[PDB]
Structure formats: C-alpha cells, structure tokens
Design a protein around this motif. Structure first.
Motif, mmCIF file in Angstrom:
data_model
loop_
_atom_site.group_PDB
_atom_site.id
_atom_site.type_symbol
_atom_site.label_atom_id
_atom_site.label_comp_id
_atom_site.label_asym_id
_atom_site.label_seq_id
_atom_site.Cartn_x
_atom_site.Cartn_y
_atom_site.Cartn_z
ATOM 1 N N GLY A 210 5.666 3.338 -15.292
ATOM 2 C CA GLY A 210 4.853 5.058 -14.678
ATOM 3 C C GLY A 210 5.634 5.285 -13.392
ATOM 4 N N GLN A 211 6.795 4.875 -13.099
ATOM 5 C CA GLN A 211 7.853 5.877 -12.251
ATOM 6 C C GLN A 211 7.804 7.054 -11.689
ATOM 7 N N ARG A 212 7.641 8.006 -11.471
ATOM 8 C CA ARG A 212 8.672 9.242 -12.007
ATOM 9 C C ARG A 212 9.917 9.242 -12.126
ATOM 10 N N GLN B 203 14.908 -5.216 9.134
ATOM 11 C CA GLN B 203 16.219 -5.266 8.360
ATOM 12 C C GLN B 203 16.781 -4.206 7.287
ATOM 13 N N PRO B 204 17.932 -3.272 7.697
ATOM 14 C CA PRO B 204 18.177 -1.755 6.971
ATOM 15 C C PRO B 204 17.834 -1.565 5.686
ATOM 16 N N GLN B 205 17.777 -1.209 4.449
ATOM 17 C CA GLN B 205 18.042 -0.183 3.529
ATOM 18 C C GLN B 205 19.320 -1.021 3.042
ATOM 19 N N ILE C 280 2.474 -4.323 -7.263
ATOM 20 C CA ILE C 280 1.526 -3.664 -7.057
ATOM 21 C C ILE C 280 1.167 -2.749 -5.478
ATOM 22 N N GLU C 281 0.496 -1.015 -6.185
ATOM 23 C CA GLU C 281 -0.229 -1.049 -5.431
ATOM 24 C C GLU C 281 -1.308 -0.509 -4.687
ATOM 25 N N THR C 282 -1.850 -1.419 -3.850
ATOM 26 C CA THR C 282 -3.792 -1.289 -3.976
ATOM 27 C C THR C 282 -3.702 -0.267 -2.661
ATOM 28 N N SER D 76 7.920 11.508 5.460
ATOM 29 C CA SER D 76 8.699 11.789 3.863
ATOM 30 C C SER D 76 10.211 10.863 3.427
ATOM 31 N N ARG D 77 9.841 10.569 2.558
ATOM 32 C CA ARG D 77 10.788 9.441 2.121
ATOM 33 C C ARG D 77 12.251 9.408 2.003
ATOM 34 N N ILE D 78 12.728 10.979 2.107
ATOM 35 C CA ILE D 78 14.233 10.952 2.784
ATOM 36 C C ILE D 78 14.580 10.920 3.889
ATOM 37 N N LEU D 79 13.595 10.515 4.977
ATOM 38 C CA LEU D 79 13.815 10.000 6.678
ATOM 39 C C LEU D 79 14.276 8.927 5.833
ATOM 40 N N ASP D 80 15.659 8.289 5.699
ATOM 41 C CA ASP D 80 16.670 7.858 5.548
ATOM 42 C C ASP D 80 18.024 8.204 5.985
ATOM 43 N N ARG E 188 10.564 -1.987 9.855
ATOM 44 C CA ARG E 188 10.358 -1.381 8.327
ATOM 45 C C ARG E 188 10.521 -2.477 7.449
ATOM 46 N N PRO E 189 10.796 -3.711 6.684
ATOM 47 C CA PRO E 189 10.332 -4.725 6.378
ATOM 48 C C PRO E 189 9.048 -5.645 6.536
ATOM 49 N N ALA E 190 8.166 -4.863 5.805
ATOM 50 C CA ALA E 190 6.699 -4.748 6.066
ATOM 51 C C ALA E 190 5.893 -6.303 6.098
ATOM 52 N N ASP F 53 0.767 -1.346 -0.175
ATOM 53 C CA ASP F 53 0.262 0.415 -0.069
ATOM 54 C C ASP F 53 0.896 0.902 -0.008
ATOM 55 N N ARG F 54 0.686 1.686 -1.457
ATOM 56 C CA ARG F 54 1.623 3.040 -1.112
ATOM 57 C C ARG F 54 2.594 2.740 -0.866
ATOM 58 N N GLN F 55 3.555 4.562 0.043
ATOM 59 C CA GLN F 55 5.035 3.997 0.511
ATOM 60 C C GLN F 55 5.570 2.770 1.230
ATOM 61 N N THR F 56 5.672 1.646 1.459
ATOM 62 C CA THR F 56 5.750 0.722 2.018
ATOM 63 C C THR F 56 6.875 -0.133 1.633
ATOM 64 N N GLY F 57 7.793 -0.034 0.549
ATOM 65 C CA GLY F 57 9.112 -0.172 0.210
ATOM 66 C C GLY F 57 9.153 -1.280 -0.872
ATOM 67 N N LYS F 58 7.913 -1.802 -1.514
ATOM 68 C CA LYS F 58 8.189 -2.827 -2.641
ATOM 69 C C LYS F 58 8.882 -2.201 -3.104
ATOM 70 N N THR F 59 9.315 -1.463 -3.793
ATOM 71 C CA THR F 59 10.424 -0.934 -4.614
ATOM 72 C C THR F 59 11.901 -1.119 -3.756
ATOM 73 N N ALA F 60 12.030 -0.756 -2.202
ATOM 74 C CA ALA F 60 12.968 -1.471 -1.583
ATOM 75 C C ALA F 60 13.219 -2.683 -1.779
ATOM 76 N N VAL F 61 11.967 -3.268 -1.710
ATOM 77 C CA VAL F 61 12.524 -4.746 -1.340
ATOM 78 C C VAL F 61 13.184 -5.316 -2.752
HETATM 79 N N1 LIG Z 1 13.638 -1.960 4.157
HETATM 80 C C1 LIG Z 1 13.543 -0.464 4.256
HETATM 81 N N2 LIG Z 1 14.971 0.250 5.244
HETATM 82 C C2 LIG Z 1 14.573 1.127 5.804
HETATM 83 N N3 LIG Z 1 14.284 2.679 4.970
HETATM 84 C C3 LIG Z 1 13.254 2.045 4.241
HETATM 85 C C4 LIG Z 1 12.585 0.132 3.698
HETATM 86 N N4 LIG Z 1 11.881 0.021 3.113
HETATM 87 C C5 LIG Z 1 11.990 1.329 3.376
HETATM 88 N N5 LIG Z 1 12.461 2.456 3.952
HETATM 89 C C6 LIG Z 1 11.900 4.025 3.474
HETATM 90 O O1 LIG Z 1 10.584 4.112 2.958
HETATM 91 C C7 LIG Z 1 11.145 5.107 2.036
HETATM 92 C C8 LIG Z 1 10.004 4.318 1.215
HETATM 93 O O2 LIG Z 1 9.659 3.227 0.144
HETATM 94 P P1 LIG Z 1 9.946 2.758 -1.256
HETATM 95 O O3 LIG Z 1 10.417 4.306 -2.034
HETATM 96 O O4 LIG Z 1 10.522 1.394 -1.228
HETATM 97 O O5 LIG Z 1 8.331 2.803 -1.095
HETATM 98 P P2 LIG Z 1 7.304 1.990 -2.158
HETATM 99 O O6 LIG Z 1 6.208 1.016 -1.706
HETATM 100 O O7 LIG Z 1 8.171 1.459 -3.404
HETATM 101 O O8 LIG Z 1 6.561 3.626 -2.170
HETATM 102 P P3 LIG Z 1 6.325 4.328 -3.912
HETATM 103 O O9 LIG Z 1 4.315 4.070 -3.817
HETATM 104 O O10 LIG Z 1 6.037 5.577 -3.922
HETATM 105 O O11 LIG Z 1 6.936 3.406 -5.193
HETATM 106 C C9 LIG Z 1 11.893 4.625 1.686
HETATM 107 O O12 LIG Z 1 12.587 6.101 0.833
HETATM 108 C C10 LIG Z 1 13.132 4.677 3.065
HETATM 109 O O13 LIG Z 1 13.174 6.055 3.227
#
Ligand SMILES: Nc1ncnc2c1ncn2[C@@H]1O[C@H](COP(=O)(O)OP(=O)(O)OP(=O)(O)O)[C@@H](O)[C@H]1O
Ligand SMILES: [Mg+2]
Lengths: 518, 50, 466, 147, 48
Positions: A203-205, A434-436, A331-333, C349-353, A366-368, A174-182
């Motif tokens: 479609g990303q920026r 886990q950290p990023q 997928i962004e639900t 804010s996504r910058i907060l990493d 943080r890994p949600a 869902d939205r900012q959750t860490g999908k691209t991070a994973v």
């Molecule tokens: N595993 C992680 N460890 C630390 N910070 C994280 C992690 N995953 C996400 N974050 C934090 O959350 C922010 C948003 O994560 P990310 O861009 O991966 O989300 P997303 O689901 O792809 O969002 P979007 O819908 O905006 O593309 C990152 O910029 C970072 O600050």
C-alpha cells in the motif's frame, strides 16, 4: 549437436499432445462492481483460484482475478488488474492453480509484483520453481528456540529489544516516525551476516517504494534483497496478496536456501511495510464482496488473515534444514491508539513490539523507541553473549532514568545519587540516538556500550555524547583495528569480558579519551 | 560459473526461439491449405465433436 | 448505444441498455434534457442484464423513468491543451467562466488515467525550489510531492498560492492548476479569481498562468469526486510536455467526503465511520498521478480540513498517508504583520534529512527550530520572572529567536502592487547561508525590524550599511 | 395475463419438450404415419401439432416449431448465446449448418458469430458456460510440448 | 562472443525446421492430407 535438439523435438510433437477436443467449463461476467466480478456459473473452481478473463476485442492482454467467494450460481472474483475493462458478458477461464509465485536465486535484487511479475523493467524473472501462496505454517515440532541474533544495527533495538532469527518483532508507530527507516537500517545491516532481506511494501506510494529501492541499491543492499510492491493505486487484491507472496519467497529461502556470496544462505528477513494497510485492503475486499463486517468494519477473519501470514515465520530445527524467516511487520497507529483492532491483533500475534512514538521523534531522539513499553519476549536469547553481558547495566540505568524522567529539568536541586542517575540516563539516551543509514556492527555497539556502562563518558558533556561515539568508533576503525576484531571473535564467549579483551578495550578507551578534548 | 549458466540459458533461449519459429511458420502454413480446401471439413468435425 | 432510465433515487440513476451495448464501468451516460443541454452521468456499477448504476453529476429534478440515454463509450472527456489555460472549468470540462466554449479542435482526454509505472519514478527525492525562505528551509517540498497547509482564512494562504504560481511560472515554465474540491463558492470563486486576476507578474496576471477547475459544495457528490481527476488530467497534459506543474487541490478532504456520499447512495456497505470501503484505493488513484517522472513533475500543495480537530479520522489519516510535507499557517504569526504565516514549528517535511537537502541545510534547519524548540519557552518564564530582569545567556537566545522570526517574513511579488514593496525570490542556498550566518552571530549587530521584510541576510546588511 | 404464466408456461414447455423428443422418431412422416409414430399420450394440442406438420410434410420443421413453442408462453429470453468463432468468415449456408447442428443444445438459441482471424481452421463453440475449442489449440499445445 | 554458437547452431533449416513444420502441420494439427504446391517455398521464405 543440433541433432540433440531435433531428437528432443519431433518426438514430443508426434506423441506428446492429446489434441482431443473436450468440453471445458467457463463463466460469464454478469456484474462488475468496484473491482468485483460475479462470473455466473463457473463450476470446478477452487476456493482461491486465479481466473483468467481471456483477451477479447479491444483488449490484447488478460486481467487475472481471485475467486474468493464460491457462492451458489455465482462466483465473486476479486480482480487483480484493472476493473475498467471487464464488462458484463465477458468469458472467464478457471486456471487450475492457486496463486503461485516464482522463487529462488533468480529473484534477488529485483522488484516484483505480488504475482511475481517484474516491475523494475530489468528483464524477465529467471526461475525454475514456483512456491504456492497461502501454505500452512511449518508446524509445532518443526521449529527450534530462537538463538541466532539478527543484528539490526541500531543500538536501541540491538541492545534493549533483541531480534533473533525466527522472531517476529513488530515495528508499530504513529505516521511519520521512522518505521520504514528502522526496517531499512535493519536491511542494510545484513551485508555480511548471510541473510536475504525481503521488503513487501503493502500500500505504499510508488514514489516511496522507488526511493526505498534507490536507497537499497545505493548502499549495495539490492544484491540480497527481494522487493515486492503492491502500491496504493494498484487494486486491493494485489495489496491483499502482497505479504503472502513475500513470505512464500522467504519460505523458499528458509527451506531450500540461495547462494549468496558463494554461501548457502537459508536465513531470510521479511518486512511487511504496512499490515495496517494490508488489513485496510482486505477490509475493502470483504466489504465489496458484502461479507459481514465486525469491529471497525473489518471482517471476522482478519485476525486469521495476519495470523496465517506471521505464523509462517519460523526458526526451523536441524532436522528440517536449520533455516529461518524473521518477520518485521510494520503498523501505523493513529494518535498512539494501541488498543485499536488491527494493532491489538498483530501485537497479540507477534513475539515483540518496537514502539516508535511521535513525541520522542519530534523531541530529538530520532530513533523514537519507547523502551518502557517496547518488549522482546525472546529477550537475551536473541543477543550475542557480549551484548547480553554489556546491555544489562544499560537497561537498568535507562529504567532508573525513566523512573526519574520527570526530574531532568530539576536535576540541580536533587540528591547527589539522583542527579548522577539522571545524568547517566541522559548520556545513555543521547548515546542511543542514531543517524539514518548508519548501522553499527555488533563489535562497535559492544565497545560503545562497554565504554558507557563503565564510568568513561561521565566527563563528556551530554550534547557531545553522540559526537563522542561518532569519533570513538572511527578511532577504533583506524587507530586500533585489532580490538574490534578481538571483540567480534569472542562475542560468543560465556564470560565475554575475558581479561585479554578487557585490557584491550580499556586501553583503547583510555588512549582515545587522553588525546581528544570534549 | 555465471558464464556457464548464461550459456545454458542461451541454449534454452535458442530452443524456445526455434519453437516460436516452427509454431509461427506452421500458423502461416496451413492457412492457404484451409483456404484451398477443408474449411468446412473442420467445421463438420467440430460440430460432430459436440 | 441508447438505453432507457429505469430508476431515479436522488443523484443515483439506474439505466437499462441493450444486451450487447452495455457501457463500461467509467463511461459517461449524457442524459439529454429538453432545453438543449445534457446531463452527463458517470457509470459506477455494471449489474443485472444490461443495467448500469451511475452517479448523476447533476440535479436530476426533471427526469422521468423513460428518458433515453446516449452512452459516450469513453469516460468523461475533458479538454486539455494550451487553450484550457487561464480558464475556469467544471467537473465535465465545460468552461464555466464568462468567455466562450472550448473549440472542437482542442484535444479531449479521458478523466481516468493510469498513474506512471514504477520504472518511471525517480529513484532519489529532489527538493522543489519555491523561493520562500520559511518554506524552502523548514518544510521543503518534493519534486512530484504532496504538501498540505493547515490554515483558516486571513492567514495569507491565497497569497501563498499566488506567489507559488508566480515563482514556478518565472523560474521554470511553471504552469499551474487549481482544483477547488468542495469549497465555499464565495472563498473559492470571486475571491480567488479576482485576487489572481489582480495579482500580476512580468505584466502577466497569475490567472493567465493558471488553470482552474471548481467542484463546489453545491454540486452533487460525483462532481466533487471527479473534479480532482479533471484537474489531474489537465495537469498531466502539461506534464507530458516535460514542463513542471504545480497543482493545488483545495480541500482534498472534501474529495474523500464526496466519495463517501457516492458510496452511501450506491448501496456500498459502509466502512469505519460511514466512510466508503474503497477509501485507500480511491485516494491512491488520485495521489499516485501526482509524482515526478523523467519527463516532468506534478508538484502538489493541497489543503486539508480535518473535521473538528480529529487527525485520527479516516479521511485525514488517508490524506496523511500520501503527504510529503505539512505547512502550518497560524493566526498569531499572521496578526504580527509577518506576511508568510508559516509556523517554524509544526511544519514538517520528510525531505529535511541530510541525505537529500544536504548536511548544511539539515544542520541549520536543526539549529533554527531549536532556539524555537522551546518556542522561546523562556516566554513563559519572562511572564512570571520578567527574565529575572535578564537571563545569563537566554536573553541572547530570545534576541536570535525574535530576529529569525522576523526574518522568516519575505516580500512577495504578487503583493508588490499592494504593499508597494518589490518581491524577493530567495534560492534555497541563499536561505541556508543567510540563516547559518545569522546563527553564527553576524546578525547580532543589526537591531530587530531590519529583518522585517528582506530576502537575504546580504539584503539585510545592505540596509544596515545604508 | 399474470395468472396465465404458470399454467400456460407449463403447457407450452410440455408441448415443446414432446415435439423435440418426437422429432427424431417422427421424421418425414404423414398424418397416419406420425399418428403411428408420435405417442398419442401427449397433450391434445401436442398430438395435433405433431400430426398436422407431418400431414403437410413440414415435420422436419416441426422440431423448429417446438423452438417457438415455449416462447409462446414465455418471455423467450433464455436462449443460450452459442457464440461461434471462426477465422474464415462464414456464408449464410455455413451459418445455417452451424445453427442446425447447434439446435442439439436447447433449440436454435441466440447464436452470435465472430472472426478472430488469428485462429486457423476449426471453430470455437461457446454454448452457455461450456467452450469447445478446435482451431489453434493444437499448435499452442504443440508449442507447450516443445518448450 | 561465444553466443555466436547459437547462430551457427540454428543454421540447420533442412535438418530440423523443414521436417518439424511438415510433421507438426500434417500429422498433428490437421489430418495427414497436406497436398498443395508451394508449402516448401513458403516455409523457406518464412524461415529466412
Ligand atoms: N533514524 C533516523 N535518522 C534520521 N532521520 C530519520 C530517522 N528516522 C526517520 N527520519 C526522518 O523522518 C522521515 C520519515 O521517516 P520514515 O519515512 O521512515 O517514517 P515512517 O514511519 O515509515 O512514515 P510513513 O508513515 O510516512 O511511511 C525520514 O524521511 C527522515 O527525514
Ligand atoms: Mg513508512
């Protein structure tokens, strides 16, 4: 030997060209909409050709378009470039080729359009083979059961939700959750596992794709990664054909392979960064073409749309090459609406799901990942024997903790066994945090999980568990480099905790715990 | 190996470059040839080609 | 280059042009009226035989079916330059303020422009230094990034906008642009004009450093659709000079709504809940010009109004797909005399990493908002236990939480002439150091109300010593 | 006027088609010569129109009369846009030559001329939705063979 | 540095480019009639 050049020339000049004039069939643009042209009577056009729109006065370039609708006395062509220049009366020429993309060793570490045109500004693409977009899936008898594991580098995925080569695991969140991070953590972890990652970025920026490419370059992962990108500002045709271009580039790796680190790599990993945005782009394309909508205004063949794309990700058997193509759709639900149309379609298509929840993301995990609902139908077949042997107790204890998850704040006034289960679950959950950009190799994850499942972190307080891991591996990285290699060497052994590695790991854990204080 | 590959690519680039030169100089040439005579001959030939 | 109107249905005008002189897809039609002025339309669909369907941009309550139309060849041309600074404009670039028209010597630029290519985009996110402690700590901006405030009226959002403009104009060159898209004419105008004209910094009013473009709810859907692009063009002119630009698109959601109406009247087939099929592309063509290139950066802080409270709605979801930070202004914080009503929680804010801001900035920003992670959940316990008289250690946490909540407030320069308190500009390093040292316990010696309106921890100490 | 459309249009199209078909056979004839040449089975106005032009010797323009024949009972807007591109700017006699060789596509339909100087020799004939290119196609085909 | 082999190889104006121009322009593109004084000088000045 310039005479060789003179001989190869002066022969094809004299007798290599017909030069016979002939009537060719063109079309006239008769209506330009919101990126849609009608092309009037352009016959002999294939159902998905890429029409040309040759240059005219005031335009020194050519904008290509896809002839999606072959109506009677009209051909509705979706415009790939910018529609603001094509006007009524413009001439179009039907290039005889369905959209094809360059493939091979040349497209490594380069950001390209869905048409294969580089956009990183580092020079022309070097290639000799073009693979067609929209090819049929490999087939039924062409594949093999998924056995080789894809090491994500995140303990939660790599231990509870295995991903194997050829398995299609869905990253839904869902939205900012860490999908691209994973996805980026998975891509960065393939440094020496002989895999060619692909990132599609539908479609990303432009800023987000630029930051992703910068992260991959900064970690040195842009020597085996192919980045496709159809950003938000670009036309809906580019976003519509981006994942297909990416998976064609990946099918070249799967079938023919590329020389990575002087080794023939035939395994590829592709990350469709938003199929929820690819579906939106296809919906816009269909509605601008006035095709009949369906549920949520999506066209009828939108399940087919993602099904073609994901069913080309396969684990080929030894007869057909033994290659692979792992797909990681994203997928962004909205408000965890799993029952939505596109999420249900892709969930039914894929072989697994990695549910990323905003509640756990905001809480601190943080890994949600939500292990309760996240599944991997390949399961243990996509894990090394070491991780398979060690993660069973992890999964069991985490499930037991989840059954008692309502009880964490009342742990004191509970049974001794219930309190112990809650405490162990809290420790394991803190371990999975886990950290990023810090993926853990398979031996490190196996060592940490062996230390956790066995009663070794019980004395460590919960808030320090993460720190404990971040120290313990460092210890194994410096004090005992041999135990990590010993774990990694017999990770495929059927009875992984063989006495030698068992004593080595026990001694390492005891030595670390004795010196450190927590 | 990459140096050998780049040498082959330079040979291919030289072939493409001399092809570009021959085409461009043949476009410059025959311009004055059509200007001097035969401008209507091509028109008649194309009209008969219909 | 002259056509004749064929059909007039609301704010959609169909016009037939000569066969070889059909206008392009985004050209202006510029219907001339009898009383001297003109009605500038915008083409939307080439169709038929020389026929173009265009959006009115005006009332169209006095037009027949034979009036001539003069194609302008180029899209809507808007004045850009230093001349268009400190002035109020409409969607067409005509100055709607009291002062005179823009001179012909000023450069006119097309409203529709291509966003910067991928090569020009920054490969690493950069924090944007605003000077506000809570903004620069909890929800840092992004150079060339998007931020949305979720707040109503009376929470000081306008004062926050004014201070952001003043800070960017002082520390950097910092010209600013404000596009009121679908705003109430009372709130957007004569309560933003007067407040910014009255607000002053270095003997220069904030309004003198800010461009304004206003497409209000009364204007037809096309005007509210293209006012954002007008503001983007005006900001992009300054961005081309290398100067940093702060752009406030107030009610970006009203942009989306406008497009929906423009589609419904254009005959486009509806998508999702009545919204336009071209939703993602239309939002991208506006949100992608807001980016940080090598020459300059257009940082944007938008305002988003969600219908009812539905974040699942397609318009808020599409807006959020292009957002880098969220600032949640709250009534409770505002009514507690905390001048910056930014909620420490619900502001992400996504910058907060740690990779971008730094490990120390992330560590303290997690240390704070953790004592408030419970939102002082002790407050519920205090309500039925009275703290059980006192908490074993929680009572300390409550003291630290109250102190930091008071410390989030900051005296603003734009309000310096209202509350009689000098404005404090706090760098991000000062903010992180101050909050870290307060969390260590250095701030356990001063009572509350000593953090009430002071820029840095050092400034709080000076006060305690004096 | 509305009722005229079907019948008048059909008659005018039939007359135009008959005149165009008899244009090759009836060339440079007279009243009696074209009466023996042009088929008398056509419309009563068609045979008269075929004979009268030849009697005055304007039989060569009679086919051009056919060009105006449909437009007399039509909006006369369906004239093929036979675009003619040539790098050499064309004189009036050149354009007359092109139109007179181009009447084989429908009639002397709406023809537009352009330069595109980067062409060399030849001419690009775009009639309706068929394009014949004969100017720079050879060089670029050659550069494709060379590469 | 060895890429100077390209520069030393392309120094074959009389061997390749002149004959290629003559053949391409006369035999293939147009008819065999290529008779106007000054094409040799034009080719020489354009190649340089
Ligand atoms: N595993 C992680 N460890 C630390 N910070 C994280 C992690 N995953 C996400 N974050 C934090 O959350 C922010 C948003 O994560 P990310 O861009 O991966 O989300 P997303 O689901 O792809 O969002 P979007 O819908 O905006 O593309 C990152 O910029 C970072 O600050
Ligand atoms: Mg993402």
């Amino acid at each position: 030997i310039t005479e060789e050049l003179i001989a190869r020339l002066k022969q094809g000049i004299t007798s290599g060209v017909d030069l016979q004039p002939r009537q060719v069939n063109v079309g006239t643009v008769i209506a330009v909409g919101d990126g849609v042209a009608r092309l009037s009577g352009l016959d002999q056009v294939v159902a998905s050709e890429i029409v040309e729109f040759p240059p005219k006065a005031g335009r020194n370039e050519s904008i290509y378009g896809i002839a999606l609708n072959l109506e009677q006395d009209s051909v509705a062509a979706i415009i790939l470039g910018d529609d603001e220049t094509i006007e009524e009366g413009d001439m179009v020429t039907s290039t005889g080729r369905v959209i094809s993309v360059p493939v091979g060793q040349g497209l490594l570490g380069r950001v390209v359009n869905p048409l294969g045109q580089p956009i990183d500004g580092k020079g022309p693409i070097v290639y000799e083979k073009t693979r067609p977009i929209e090819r049929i899936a490999p087939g039924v008898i062409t594949r093999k059961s998924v056995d080789t594991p894809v090491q994500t580098g995140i303990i939660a995925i790599d231990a509870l939700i295995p991903i194997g080569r050829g398995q299609r695991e869905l990253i839904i969140g869902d939205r900012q959750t860490g999908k691209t991070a994973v996805a980026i953590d998975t891509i960065l972890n393939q440094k020496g596992q002989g895999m060619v990652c692909i990132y599609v970025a539908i479609g990303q920026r432009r800023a987000q794709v630029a930051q992703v490419v910068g992260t991959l370059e900064r970690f040195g992962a842009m020597e085996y990664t192919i980045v496709v990108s159809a950003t938000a500002s670009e036309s809906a045709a580019l976003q519509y054909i981006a994942p297909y271009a990416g998976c064609a580039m990946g099918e070249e790796i799967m079938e023919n392979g590329v020389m990575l680190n002087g080794q023939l790599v035939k395994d590829a990993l592709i990350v469709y960064d938003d199929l929820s945005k690819h579906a939106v782009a296809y919906r816009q394309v269909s509605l601008l073409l006035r095709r009949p909508p369906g549920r949520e205004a999506y066209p009828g063949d939108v399940f087919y749309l993602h099904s073609r794309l994901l069913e080309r990700a396969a684990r080929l058997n030894e007869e057909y090459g033994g290659g692979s193509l792992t797909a990681l759709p994203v997928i962004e639900t909205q408000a965890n609406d799993v029952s939505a149309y596109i999420p249900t379609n892709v969930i039914s298509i894929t072989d697994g799901q990695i549910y990323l929840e905003s509640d756990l993301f905001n809480a601190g995990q943080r890994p949600a990942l939500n292990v309760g609902i996240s599944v991997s139908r390949v399961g243990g077949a996509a894990q090394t024997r070491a991780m398979r042997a060690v993660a069973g107790k992890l999964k069991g204890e985490l499930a037991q903790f989840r059954d008692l998850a309502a009880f964490a704040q009342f742990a004191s006034d509970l049974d001794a066994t219930t309190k112990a289960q809650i405490e162990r679950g809290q420790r394991l959950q803190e371990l999975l945090k886990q950290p990023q950009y810090q993926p853990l190799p398979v031996e490190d994850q196996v060592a940490v999980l062996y230390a956790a499942t066995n009663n070794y972190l019980d004395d460590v307080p919960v808030p320090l568990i993460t720190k404990w891991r971040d120290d313990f591996l460092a210890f194994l990285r410096t004090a005992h480099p041999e135990v990590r290699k010993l774990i990694y060497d017999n990770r495929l052994d059927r009875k992984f905790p063989t006495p030698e590695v068992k004593e080595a790991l026990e001694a390492a854990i005891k030595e670390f715990k004795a010196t450190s204080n927590y | 190996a990459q140096a050998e590959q780049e040498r082959i690519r330079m040979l291919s680039e030289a072939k493409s470059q001399i092809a570009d030169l021959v085409t461009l100089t043949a476009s410059r040439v025959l311009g004055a040839e059509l200007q001097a005579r035969g401008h209507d001959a091509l028109i008649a030939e194309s009209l008969a080609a219909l | 280059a002259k056509g004749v109107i064929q059909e007039i249905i609301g704010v959609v005008i169909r016009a037939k042009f000569p066969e070889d002189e059909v206008p392009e897809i985004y050209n202006a039609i510029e219907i001339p009226l009898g009383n001297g002025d003109r009605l500038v339309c915008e083409v939307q669909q080439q169709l038929g035989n020389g026929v173009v369907k265009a959006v009115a941009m005006g009332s169209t309550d006095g037009l027949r079916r034979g009036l001539e139309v003069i194609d302008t060849g180029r899209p809507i041309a808007v004045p850009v330059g230093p001349a268009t600074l400190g002035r109020v404009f409409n969607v067409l670039g005509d100055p709607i303020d009291g002062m005179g028209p823009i001179g012909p010597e000023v450069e006119r630029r097309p409203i529709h422009r291509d966003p910067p290519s991928f090569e020009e985009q920054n490969t690493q996110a950069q924090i944007f230094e605003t000077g506000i402690k809570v903004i620069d700590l909890i929800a840092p901006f992004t150079r060339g990034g998007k931020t949305a405030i979720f707040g109503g009226a009376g929470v000081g959002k306008t004062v926050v906008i004014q201070e952001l403009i003043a800070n960017i104009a002082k520390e950097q060159s910092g010209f600013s642009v404000f596009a009121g898209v679908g705003e109430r004419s009372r709130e957007g105008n004569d309560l933003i004009h007067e407040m910014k004209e009255a607000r002053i910094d270095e003997n220069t009013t904030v309004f003198d450093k800010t461009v304004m473009v206003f497409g209000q709810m009364n204007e037809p859907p096309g005007a509210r659709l293209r006012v954002g692009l007008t503001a983007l063009t005006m900001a992009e002119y300054f961005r081309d000079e290398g100067r940093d630009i702060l752009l406030f698109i107030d009610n970006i959601f009203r942009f989306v709504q406008a497009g929906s109406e423009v589609s419904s009247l254009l005959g486009r087939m509806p998508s999702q809940v009545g919204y336009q099929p071209t939703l993602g592309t239309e939002m991208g063509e506006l949100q992608e010009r807001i980016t940080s290139t090598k020459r300059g950066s257009i940082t944007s802080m938008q305002a988003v109004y969600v219908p009812a409270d539905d974040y699942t709605d397609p318009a808020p979801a599409t807006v959020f797909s292009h957002l880098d930070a969220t600032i949640s202004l709250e009534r409770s914080i505002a009514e507690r005399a905390i001048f910056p009503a930014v909620d420490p929680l619900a502001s992400t804010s996504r910058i907060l990493d740690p990779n971008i801001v730094g490990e120390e900035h992330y560590r303290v920003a997690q240390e704070v908002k953790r004592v408030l992670q419970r939102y002082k959940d002790l407050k519920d316990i205090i309500a039925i236990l009275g703290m059980e008289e006192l908490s074993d250690e929680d009572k300390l946490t409550v003291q630290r939480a109250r102190k930091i909540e008071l410390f989030f407030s900051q005296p603003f320069t734009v309000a310096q002439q209202f509350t009689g308190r000098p404005g404090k500009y706090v760098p991000v390093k000062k903010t992180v150091e101050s909050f870290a040292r307060l969390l260590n316990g250095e701030g356990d010696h001063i009572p509350e109300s000593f953090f009430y309106m002071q820029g840095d921890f050092d400034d709080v100490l000076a006060a305690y010593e004096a | 006027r509305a009722l005229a459309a079907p019948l008048v249009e059909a008659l005018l199209t039939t007359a135009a088609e008959q005149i165009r078909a008899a244009a090759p056979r009836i060339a440079g004839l007279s009243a009696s010569e074209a009466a023996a040449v042009l088929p008398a089975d056509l419309l009563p106005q068609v045979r008269n129109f075929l004979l009268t032009m030849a009697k005055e010797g304007l039989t060569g323009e009679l086919n051009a009369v056919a060009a105006a024949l449909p437009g007399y009972l039509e909006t006369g807007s369906r004239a093929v846009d036979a675009s003619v591109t040539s790098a050499i700017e064309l004189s009036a006699e050149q354009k007359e030559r092109i139109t007179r060789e181009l009447q084989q596509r429908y009639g002397d339909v709406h023809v537009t001329y352009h330069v595109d100087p980067t062409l060399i020799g030849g001419l690009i004939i775009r009639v309706g939705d068929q394009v014949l290119d004969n100017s720079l196609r050879a060089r670029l085909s050659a550069i494709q063979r060379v590469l």
